[PDB]
Amino acid sequence: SLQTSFVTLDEAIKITNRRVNAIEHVIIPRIERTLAYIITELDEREREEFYRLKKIQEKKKILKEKSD
Amino acid sequence: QVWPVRQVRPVTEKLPANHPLLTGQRVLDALFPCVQGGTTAIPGVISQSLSKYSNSDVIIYVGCGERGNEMSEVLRDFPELTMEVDGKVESIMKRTALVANTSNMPVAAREASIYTGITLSEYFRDMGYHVSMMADSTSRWAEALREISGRLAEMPADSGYPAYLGARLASFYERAGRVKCLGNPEREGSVSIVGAVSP
Amino acid sequence: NYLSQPRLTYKTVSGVNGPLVILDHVKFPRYAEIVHLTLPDGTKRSGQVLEVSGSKAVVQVFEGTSGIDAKKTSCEFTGDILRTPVSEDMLGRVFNGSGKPIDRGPVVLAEDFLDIMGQPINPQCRIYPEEMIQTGISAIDGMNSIARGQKIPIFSAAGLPHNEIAAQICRQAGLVENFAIVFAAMGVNMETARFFKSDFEENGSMDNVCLFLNLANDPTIERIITPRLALTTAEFLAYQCEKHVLVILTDMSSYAEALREVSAAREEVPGRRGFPGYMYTDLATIYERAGRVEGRNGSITQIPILTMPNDDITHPIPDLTGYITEGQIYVDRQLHNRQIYPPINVLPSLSRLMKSAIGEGMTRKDHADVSNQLYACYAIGKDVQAMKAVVGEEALTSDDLLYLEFLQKFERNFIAQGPYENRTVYETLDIGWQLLRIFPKEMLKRIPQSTLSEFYPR
Amino acid sequence: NYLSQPRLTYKTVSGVNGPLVILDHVKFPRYAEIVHLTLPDGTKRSGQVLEVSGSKAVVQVFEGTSGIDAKKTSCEFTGDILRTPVSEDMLGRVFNGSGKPIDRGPVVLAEDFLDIMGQPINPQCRIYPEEMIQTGISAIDGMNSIARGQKIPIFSAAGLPHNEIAAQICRQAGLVKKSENFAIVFAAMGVNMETARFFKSDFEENGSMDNVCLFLNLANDPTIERIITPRLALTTAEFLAYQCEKHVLVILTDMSSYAEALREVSAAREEVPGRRGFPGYMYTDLATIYERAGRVEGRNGSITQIPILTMPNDDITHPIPDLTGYITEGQIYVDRQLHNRQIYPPINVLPSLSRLMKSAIGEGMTRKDHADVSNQLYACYAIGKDVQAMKAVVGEEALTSDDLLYLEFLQKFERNFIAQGPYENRTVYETLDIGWQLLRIFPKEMLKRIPQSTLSEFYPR
Amino acid sequence: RIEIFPSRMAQTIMKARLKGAQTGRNLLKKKSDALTLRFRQILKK
């Protein structure tokens, strides 16, 4: 009764220690460098909005220098 | 009488809201209840239960930027939507006013359909009635503010919206509440607002 | 009525940048006024006033500023806004983006002159679309069905067969009545043009097809008036000569790119991703010119194809066309890589007018319940296929092998049909029950027992 | 320092665009000058001057710009910047966001006229905070205890009861009994009509209004008055503390609705929006109302702040709770996990922290076992939450006799210690006595963070 | 290896998908430890 539960236990340990190491090494390092890509790409959408708004505030100043 | 839409109707005293607004849906009435005189926000034709019942006297529905063939179904079934009062099968267009505004209509008139439907709702508030306002898709109202502020060359907030977007929604949601109305016969009315956002 | 005063001609061009030509010393200029440019070489271009300020008028030329001078270029002002010569003889012709004939026929002899912006329909006198259009495609007719007078786009991408299923529902009009097709093509290739132009004559259906095709070598400013010329003849053949028009506005993402280039030439405040802030209004004026009115027995149905960039449904073009139109049809890339035609992810597809166009008198009785169950079975099966790759194949449930056996039968028998199968709607539901019969009862939760007992034991 | 020159009244309005009114031909205009608009139909409005340029002065009207003409309106320049009428009899009065009384009372008799911007406290004059402020909540007084001068926010979300535990720690705040000059300045920014009515009718209906100075600012109030609301509330709290020498607690609720008003006026001055729409100077602007705290060297007063804010989408990387955690000194989380579980107050003490609680508690301050019963209740809470994840994948049988004792501690910690009820005022001694009734269900030698020099006196009972 | 488009709601979707896998180890580390604890005492028996 202790031989048949022994050899079926390390059959269910290798299918669990692989599923733990499939998450720590394949699934989580794919998500944590996906999330590193969202932040670097959302910083570039803010500077493109920063450049479009500073372009307009430079144009609105020139039109207010004519009407003086 | 003639009243400007962007100016709040005067009143004697604002009162705390203590009576529930029974929507009829079981999750909205038991777990997360609304009261008459209170403000609500869903990410939303549907909501027929607000019309047939919910113990409110008049119903004012504002379709702010609603679609083409979905606006024409609201004004199609509302004349033949009936209810019971004391055993009489009575139609719901005796106590319903619609503010129909499709997105084909101009963008300056989309921001004025909200202020119109709350002024008619504050008018029937003053008679002692219990108004229930359903402002459909206020995200299209906030889209009309993004377009108008872009045409006047204004500086935006995050995601392109104008920076006074939080002060425009607050000037419409804070017009709803149970009150003691102005005038001598001592009556009390209320306005409930259910506004929709991006689903 | 008519204007008899002579047209003022100005040689006072004071600025050219991109698509825009800026005039000066103009005497009382209108807004949206059409201007006829006369080049020094002798060629003639058209224009349209975008902005007036005192005696200055900013026009947008339709054919481009390539060669436009500032000393010798004369611009005569047509004293009215852009009005189109329309007739019933345009059905069966080929025009370009500006309405000029391409098929080597004559120019149009007008029955009337109609404004391209359209007159606004009173929303109180607008009747509701309830007659169901049978398209022949099971992924449309069985799941996301289309009424008669419903605006409904086709969300696609670059490299997907959106032109193939645009011409398939164009020759399989169904209605269980000779739909007069008006076709607007903006930014299409010559391969896409010759695909559509040969399909309509191979079926012999170019007796009633009006092509408005604007290719990629054509200038981009003609794309701004291309859907408004296509719709102002579609609402002539629907509200005056009472036919049942079907309007196919393919590549609506090449319309919004033409709308950005003008909006970036005027240096206006841009909205999201460089598109103008008025792109929600400018799209809605050409989507809500649809539907059907109460005095006339004509109708107009819009199917605008648009290709979203980088498979993004949160891009500002397919995000704004979801708020105006009445449910989308999603063409998916991952179903196209598995060689399934048509590749239609029914999980983000939607038809907001399908609830009233099906039922007992419209379709047969079990339509509202087998479409309600095939969606919920596909969504859970798409969720148990994601955990099949992660944690194990047979793991944690044996009835999940029924959901994956549904996903193999749904994608290969229901939605995969080939480019010439015309499945009727009764043939669509009979395939739909064969995929629900591999599920047992008590798992078909969304079907009540008053309809589950008639069609499950078959 | 009185000024006696008569005020000028200009009818020279030369431009209106949004909430700004542009004047012309102004004789030497001040920068932050307070002006008084007079409409053509007689209604009065106020306003701050926003930007001057030569003889042109751009004011922005408080109450809005509608109806303002260019020919018949008249603007009157009061020759000084915005001042505050401060007194000690503003303890028990309800003011709006601009300083006018709301509770049907008279104006304040103004025993001093102070500036709302103030001055920064000298770093050489500030002294370290020592004793404790009793809030009456066991999750705050027991395990995340606050000092006298500590700045500690309450990180909440939309829908969580951060307004209900703000009103709780205002009704029952005291120093410590220790067997005395205590005041509270409550500033509400951007609240509803229902939340403002709840704050007015909870403080006056509980006897607490002998020492509360309440500043409402509704959401239908002008958005410029949300900026001068924490500047009014901290000017008077610098008059009560270290000018009248009483220990002051300042509760600045909804600090996420303050910086939505700061973003609004930053677009009125035509500035380019910085990170996530918020302005670039928001770290300086938030720290000019947080760093008006702490104790000073020569005066017995003190001032401690609890700036309550709602982080959107439960995000800590948002600029509102990230630029607050850089300057404030430890946080308190109201979380959705315990709130759906119906636990009031829903304060989880595992991510919460008070950085100066090692100074606040002690032998002469509360009693000498507070340092060990807080470390032991926190260590037994992390284990009892860890073994509760073992109860589902292993089983209730296979876990040992130790892990069955942590699970019986967990159902009693979150029901007797944290779960309090909105009207139960527990002292700092009644908090620690509940803290020993949950440690007595363990045998000792499991209580490894408590030394035996303090385990012998308080365990056997 | 990236998955989808950055849209400021994909940041809060992927922070929840990270939250699912961060607690997927700590729920399965102890399951592999409960199996190892019985494996090391059966071998003694």
PDB file of C-alpha atoms in Angstrom, chain E:
ATOM      1  CA  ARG E   1       7.638  38.231 -26.967  1.00  0.00           C
ATOM      2  CA  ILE E   2       4.684  40.619 -26.779  1.00  0.00           C
ATOM      3  CA  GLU E   3       0.978  39.888 -27.221  1.00  0.00           C
ATOM      4  CA  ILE E   4      -1.413  42.797 -27.932  1.00  0.00           C
ATOM      5  CA  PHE E   5      -1.725  46.539 -28.565  1.00  0.00           C
ATOM      6  CA  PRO E   6      -0.948  49.152 -25.855  1.00  0.00           C
ATOM      7  CA  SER E   7      -4.197  50.992 -25.175  1.00  0.00           C
ATOM      8  CA  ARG E   8      -4.160  51.938 -21.394  1.00  0.00           C
ATOM      9  CA  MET E   9      -6.822  49.270 -20.813  1.00  0.00           C
ATOM     10  CA  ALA E  10      -4.470  46.538 -21.984  1.00  0.00           C
ATOM     11  CA  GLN E  11      -2.226  47.708 -19.143  1.00  0.00           C
ATOM     12  CA  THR E  12      -4.915  46.896 -16.573  1.00  0.00           C
ATOM     13  CA  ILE E  13      -5.935  43.692 -18.356  1.00  0.00           C
ATOM     14  CA  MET E  14      -2.357  42.402 -18.359  1.00  0.00           C
ATOM     15  CA  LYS E  15      -1.849  43.512 -14.752  1.00  0.00           C
ATOM     16  CA  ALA E  16      -4.746  41.194 -13.902  1.00  0.00           C
ATOM     17  CA  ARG E  17      -3.329  38.409 -16.080  1.00  0.00           C
ATOM     18  CA  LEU E  18      -0.068  38.944 -14.216  1.00  0.00           C
ATOM     19  CA  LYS E  19      -2.075  38.789 -10.978  1.00  0.00           C
ATOM     20  CA  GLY E  20      -3.525  35.437 -12.029  1.00  0.00           C
ATOM     21  CA  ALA E  21      -0.104  33.910 -12.662  1.00  0.00           C
ATOM     22  CA  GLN E  22       1.561  35.498  -9.623  1.00  0.00           C
ATOM     23  CA  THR E  23      -0.945  33.653  -7.429  1.00  0.00           C
ATOM     24  CA  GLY E  24      -0.771  30.623  -9.718  1.00  0.00           C
ATOM     25  CA  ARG E  25       2.706  29.791  -8.442  1.00  0.00           C
ATOM     26  CA  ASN E  26       2.050  30.369  -4.728  1.00  0.00           C
ATOM     27  CA  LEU E  27      -1.074  28.217  -4.987  1.00  0.00           C
ATOM     28  CA  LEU E  28       0.879  25.484  -6.806  1.00  0.00           C
ATOM     29  CA  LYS E  29       4.155  25.800  -4.891  1.00  0.00           C
ATOM     30  CA  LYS E  30       2.448  24.551  -1.730  1.00  0.00           C
ATOM     31  CA  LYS E  31       0.553  21.852  -3.643  1.00  0.00           C
ATOM     32  CA  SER E  32       3.919  20.621  -4.893  1.00  0.00           C
ATOM     33  CA  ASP E  33       5.170  20.990  -1.305  1.00  0.00           C
ATOM     34  CA  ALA E  34       2.255  19.048   0.197  1.00  0.00           C
ATOM     35  CA  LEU E  35       2.994  16.293  -2.320  1.00  0.00           C
ATOM     36  CA  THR E  36       6.701  16.464  -1.433  1.00  0.00           C
ATOM     37  CA  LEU E  37       5.973  16.348   2.317  1.00  0.00           C
ATOM     38  CA  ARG E  38       4.014  13.111   1.928  1.00  0.00           C
ATOM     39  CA  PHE E  39       6.688  11.823  -0.473  1.00  0.00           C
ATOM     40  CA  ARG E  40       9.425  12.297   2.134  1.00  0.00           C
ATOM     41  CA  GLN E  41       7.522  10.536   4.935  1.00  0.00           C
ATOM     42  CA  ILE E  42       6.220   7.632   2.844  1.00  0.00           C
ATOM     43  CA  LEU E  43       9.877   6.967   1.983  1.00  0.00           C
ATOM     44  CA  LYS E  44      10.576   6.872   5.719  1.00  0.00           C
ATOM     45  CA  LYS E  45       7.703   4.407   6.131  1.00  0.00           C
TER      46      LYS E  45
END
